[PDB]
């Protein structure tokens, strides 16, 4: 039939064709010879530091393309304002080598980047995003103020609101604005004498970086790390978040009374801060964004991953399961109870959260909306399907097409 990828849902038997992928202008890591779709950090998108100013041409075409997307979103494609903005952009790049976005263009680009993220299952909310324009920020100290305002607004005392703060873009012949921390909220990871780790193993390096930069470490499993903010050409400055700004949820179980005694907990705000926001060729090296958690991120990955908190065995022992044999499914049982605890504790604390069933059901709805709206939706199957109960959620049975669209959120090298 149609010359576009044919996509099938095996639960419903329905079919669709992805025409949106025809708009992709950035190559992925796959070829007809082999699929590299399951690689976390394949070397393509990877926004490696490209110091020396970019080719006035490649920048222009990217810019023109973005401006077209913008005028199309407001329905003025081909108008005088559209042709004037195009002229104004190339004129800017013509003398300065770069250009700037109008306020409304930044808001549009930012939402679109979220909309284009193949690995995000919460995209049904893409239209509701608070965009804080912080392109006037000129110091590491101001960055901190902006971030604190972000955390405050986004947290909204448990009734979380999606938001993103955009700091100044990459400027040729000038340093980058960078947040060294992967997330605005991170638990310290202390490398023990015996080689083990106290706290969160994922954050061992950043923890040791904060220390080397004057941070006085603690010794708990849930110590909130300080922020390492870097302004152009200056060394990173250390900033401690005021405890009142970091909302946390102590974990307890609805029926297993001993669970509370485990002393487990997690913060309410998931805010990625080390990714690069790219719009029309312009690169925003510092643009932290936040939403709310899907229960499996905490209950399954963060708490049960072998290289993270790894509490599966502890809980199983408390539940008196046979951890000596796989066939007892002690891991499966404990994990289920841990995820339930996360859901229960967040609900009790009146802090926003969404389980993997509701999350994926709503993503299916997002897929229908996008099918009608753009003729498809780029999606990374391995990241969309939850870490537990895969085939129990609708997305498992939904084939997906993955490709790169811009604006986009990209990975970037560590500043150190």
Ligand X SMILES: C[As](C)(=O)[O-]
Ligand Y SMILES: Nc1nc2c(c(=O)[nH]1)N1C(=O)OC[C@H]1CN2
Report the interface residues with ligand X, using CB under 6 A: 258, 261, 317-318
Residue 39 binds Zn ion (CB under 5 A): no
Instruction: Identify the DSSP state of 261.
Output: G
Residue 8 binds ligand Y (CB under 6 A): no
Residue 211: both structure tokens together: 């220390």
Residue 37 binds Zn ion (CB under 5 A): yes
Rounded CA-CA distance 310/307 in Å is 7
Footprint (CB under 6 A) of ligand HEM, residues 322-361: 354, 359
Q: Is 313 exposed, middle or buried (0-12, 13-18, 19+ CB in 10 A)?
A: middle
| Binding-site residue positions for L-arginine | 183, 292-293, 297, 302
Out of 115, 123, 178, 410, pick the active-site residue: 123
* Residue 120 annotated as catalytic: yes
Question: Residue 164 or 268: which CB sits closer to ligand HEM?
Answer: 164
Pick one of ligand X, Zn ion, its own copies, none as the site partner of residue 261 (Cβ within 5 to 8 A by kind).
ligand X
Q: What angle do CA 363, 108, 37 make, to 5 degrees?
A: 45
Residue 191 forms beta bridges with which residues? Answer: 197
Q: What is the layout of strands, in order, in the sheet containing 130-133? A: 130-133, 163-166, 289-290, 271-272
From the CB of residue 304, how many other CB atoms can be counted at a distance below 10 Å? 23
Rounded CA-CA distance 395/365 in Å is 11
Number of residues that this document lists for the chain: 416
Footprint (CB under 6 A) of ligand HEM, residues 130-169: 162, 164
Footprint (CB under 6 A) of ligand HEM, residues 234-273: 272
Question: Residue 238 or 272: which CB sits closer to ligand HEM?
Answer: 272
Size of the site for ligand HEM (CB under 6 A): 20
Task: State whether residue 141 is helix, strand or coil.
Answer: helix
What are the C-alpha distances in Å from 172 to residues 54, 55, 176, 230? Answer: 8, 12, 9, 17
Rounded CA-CA distance 31/203 in Å is 34
* Smallest separation, CB 154 to its own copies (Å): 22
Question: Residue 233 or 257: which CB sits closer to ligand X?
Answer: 257
Residue 45 forms beta bridges with which residues? Answer: none
Residue 308 binds ligand Y (CB under 6 A): no
Residue 238 forms beta bridges with which residues? Answer: 228
Residue 278 binds ligand HEM (CB under 6 A): no
* Smallest separation, CB 234 to its own copies (Å): 32
Pick one of ligand HEM, ligand X, Zn ion, none as the site partner of residue 379 (Cβ within 5 to 8 A by kind).
none
Pick one of its own copies, ligand X, ligand Y, none as the site partner of residue 33 (Cβ within 5 to 8 A by kind).
its own copies
* Smallest separation, CB 168 to its own copies (Å): 32
What are the C-alpha distances in Å from 72 to residues 18, 61, 62, 67, 366? Answer: 20, 16, 15, 8, 21
Q: What is the largest CA-CA distance in the chain?
A: 73
* Residue 83 annotated as catalytic: no
* Smallest separation, CB 359 to ligand HEM (Å): 6
* Residue 292 annotated as catalytic: yes
Out of 114, 126, 266, 292, pick the active-site residue: 292
* Smallest separation, CB 389 to its own copies (Å): 5
* Smallest separation, CB 17 to Zn ion (Å): 18
**Whether 178 contacts 230, CB under 8 Å:** yes
Alpha helices, DSSP H, located in 97-191: 103-116, 140-155
| Binding-site residue positions | 30, 35, 38, 120, 183, 292-293, 297, 302, 382-383, 396, 411
* Residue 266 annotated as catalytic: no
Question: Residue 268 or 294: which CB sits closer to ligand HEM?
Answer: 294
| Residue found under tokens 């919460």 | 122
151, 210, 294, 298: which one binds ligand HEM (CB under 6 A): 294
Task: State whether residue 229 is helix, strand or coil.
Answer: strand
What are the C-alpha distances in Å from 398 to residues 8, 13, 119, 323? Answer: 6, 10, 15, 34
Residue 353: both structure tokens together: 């959260």
Angle between helices 103-116 and 56-73 (to 10 degrees): 90
Question: Residue 37 or 232: which CB sits closer to its own copies?
Answer: 37
Out of 297, 330, 370, 410, pick the active-site residue: 297
153, 222, 383, 411: which one binds ligand Y (CB under 6 A): 383
Question: Residue 129 or 228: which CB sits closer to ligand HEM?
Answer: 129
Residue 416 binds ligand Y (CB under 6 A): no
Binding site for ligand Y (CB under 6 A): 10, 40, 382-383, 396-397
Binding site for Zn ion (CB under 5 A): 30, 35, 37
Residues labelled catalytic:
120, 123, 292, 297
């Amino acid at each position: 039939g149609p010359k576009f990828p044919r996509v099938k849902n095996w639960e419903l038997g329905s079919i669709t064709y992805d025409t949106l992928c025809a708009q992709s202008q950035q190559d992925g890591p796959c070829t007809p010879r082999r699929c590299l779709g399951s690689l976390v950090l394949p070397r393509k998108l990877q926004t490696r530091p490209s110091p020396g100013p970019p080719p006035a041409e490649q920048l222009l075409s990217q810019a023109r393309d973005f401006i077209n997307q913008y005028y199309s979103s407001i329905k003025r494609s081909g108008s005088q304002a559209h042709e004037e903005r195009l002229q104004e952009v190339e004129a800017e790049v013509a003398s300065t080598g770069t250009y700037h976005l109008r306020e409304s263009e930044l808001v549009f680009g930012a939402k679109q980047a979220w909309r284009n993220a193949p690995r995000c299952v919460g995209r049904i909310q893409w239209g509701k995003l608070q965009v804080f324009d912080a392109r006037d920020c000129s110091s590491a100290q101001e960055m901190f103020t902006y971030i604190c305002n972000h955390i405050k607004y986004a947290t909204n005392r448990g009734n979380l609101r999606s938001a993103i703060t955009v700091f100044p873009q990459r400027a040729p012949g000038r340093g980058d604005f960078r947040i060294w921390n992967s997330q605005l909220v991170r638990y310290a990871g202390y490398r023990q004498q015996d080689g083990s780790v106290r706290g969160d193993p994922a954050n061992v390096e950043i923890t040791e970086l904060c220390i080397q930069h004057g941070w006085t470490p603690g010794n708990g499993r849930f110590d909130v790390l300080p922020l390492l903010l870097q302004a152009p050409d200056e060394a990173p400055e250390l900033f401690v978040l005021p405890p009142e700004l970091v909302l946390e949820v102590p974990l307890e179980h609805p029926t297993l009374e001993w669970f509370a005694a485990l002393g487990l907990r997690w913060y309410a705000l998931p805010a990625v801060s080390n990714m690069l926001l790219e719009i029309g060729g312009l690169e925003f090296s510092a643009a932290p964004f936040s939403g709310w958690y899907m229960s499996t991120e905490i209950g399954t990955r963060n708490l049960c991953d072998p290289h993270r908190y790894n509490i599966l065995e502890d809980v199983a022992v408390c539940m008196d399961l046979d951890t000596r044999t796989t066939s007892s499914l002690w891991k499966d049982k404990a994990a289920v109870e841990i995820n339930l605890a996360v859901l229960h504790s967040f609900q009790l604390a009146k802090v926003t959260i969404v389980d993997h069933h509701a999350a994926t059901v709503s993503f299916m709805k997002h897929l229908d909306n996008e099918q009608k709206a753009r003729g498809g939706c780029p999606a990374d199957w391995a990241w969309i399907v939850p870490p537990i109960s895969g085939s129990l959620t609708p997305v498992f049975h939904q084939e997906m097409v993955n490709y790169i669209l811009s604006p986009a959120f990209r990975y970037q090298p560590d500043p150190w």
